[PDB]
UniProtKB/Swiss-Prot annotation:
Pathological condition linked to this protein in its record: Deafness, autosomal recessive, 84A: A form of non-syndromic deafness characterized by progressive, sensorineural hearing loss and vestibular dysfunction. Deafness, autosomal dominant, 73: A form of non-syndromic hearing loss characterized by mild to severe bilateral symptoms with variable age of onset from early childhood to the third decade.
Gene: PTPRQ
Function: Dephosphorylates phosphatidylinositol phosphates, such as phosphatidylinositol 3,4,5-trisphosphate (PIP3) and phosphatidylinositol 3,5-diphosphates, with preference for PIP3. Phosphate can be hydrolyzed from the D3 and D5 positions in the inositol ring. Has low tyrosine-protein phosphatase activity in vitro; however, the relevance of such activity in vivo is unclear. Plays an important role in adipogenesis of mesenchymal stem cells (MSCs). Regulates the phosphorylation state of AKT1 by regulating the levels of PIP3 in MSCs and preadipocyte cells.
Residues annotated as catalytic: 214 (phosphocysteine intermediate)
Protein name: Phosphatidylinositol phosphatase PTPRQ
Domain Tyrosine-protein phosphatase: 24-273
Domain of life: Eukaryota
Subunit composition and interactions: Interacts with TPRN. TPRN, CLIC5 and PTPQR form concentric rings at the base of stereocilia and may form a complex.
Residue range from the parent sequence: 2015 to 2293 of 2332
Organism (species): Homo sapiens
Topological domains, Cytoplasmic: 3-274
Length: 274
């Protein structure tokens, strides 16, 4: 196993595609779904199981996002969310599922406690966890959310939200990509790549994470985080290692880049960029 040079990349992909994606499938089937010997037992505890949309998609104990715990309430520290490294720093991202109705409060508690100023939503539209224009204030525990603005563009919608607790407050920008097809991957890579760049340009200049979500927090979320890595990488280097990147992402959250179509789409994006 080795990274692939930019000059060799198209030939590499052509070889993977031949004989009905024979080698693409072989390769993708080589990647285990999860890392052997990293526990995910916290996510399997009885008091946490209803906080997971899919019983087979769980964060690892070591890098799950831990909410402030109440010692008298088991599971008060739990959300199905994982820290994921970015290209320039560890813990740049949190990969999470879109909240379940019963974990909306937990989701906003995560936003508050991590001081996250940017959310990336890859679905439409799956529970709306932000206020409606006609009911623009919502309350979860001691956290209050106020919708401040909405900006609907062709391939995404931007929403600014105020979050407050005990009078302290923060503004959070939600970047909601709206151009992902109901089935399969985007036919055209350009809108998603533009969205990746837009999100990065909007980010807070502090060490706080960006929260990225999709239904399971692994498929579309994995593609988005992988593209944010790959787009930066190819500006600094003349080789690319999508296989190794996915193996690293899976070492931080099981099943990141969940299916062969998503894996192939990452290669198509690189082809389009070169
Ligand atoms: Cl979602």
């Amino acid at each position: 196993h080795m990274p692939i040079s930019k000059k060799s990349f198209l030939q590499h992909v052509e070889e993977l595609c031949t004989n009905n994606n024979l080698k693409f499938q072989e390769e993708f089937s080589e990647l285990p779904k999860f890392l052997q010997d990293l526990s995910s037992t916290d996510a399997d505890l009885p008091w946490n199981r209803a906080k997971n949309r899919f019983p087979n998609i769980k964060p690892y104990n070591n890098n799950r996002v831990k909410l402030i715990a109440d010692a008298s309430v088991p599971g008060s520290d739990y959300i199905n969310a994982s820290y994921i490294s970015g290209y320039l720093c560890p813990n740049e991202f949190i990969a999470t599922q879109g909240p379940l109705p019963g974990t909306v409060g937990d989701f906003w508690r995560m936003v508050w406690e991590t001081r996250a100023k940017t959310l990336v939503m890859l679905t439409q539209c799956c529970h709306q966890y932000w206020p409606e224009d006609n009911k623009p204030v919502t309350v979860f525990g001691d956290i209050v959310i106020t919708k401040l603005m909405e900006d609907v563009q062709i391939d995404w919608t931007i929403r600014d939200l105020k979050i407050e607790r005990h009078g302290d407050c923060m503004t959070v920008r939600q970047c909601n990509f709206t151009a992902w097809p109901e089935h399969g991957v985007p036919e055209n890579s350009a809108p998603l790549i533009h969205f990746v760049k837009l999100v990065r340009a909007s980010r807070a200049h502090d060490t706080t994470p960006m929260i990225v979500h999709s239904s399971a927090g692994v498929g579309r979320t994995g593609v988005f985080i992988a593209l944010d890595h790959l787009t930066q990488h190819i500006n600094d280097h003349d080789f690319v290692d999508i296989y190794g990147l996915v193996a690293e992402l899976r070492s931080e959250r099981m099943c990141m880049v969940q299916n062969l179509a998503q894996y192939i789409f990452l290669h198509q994006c690189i082809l389009d960029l070169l």
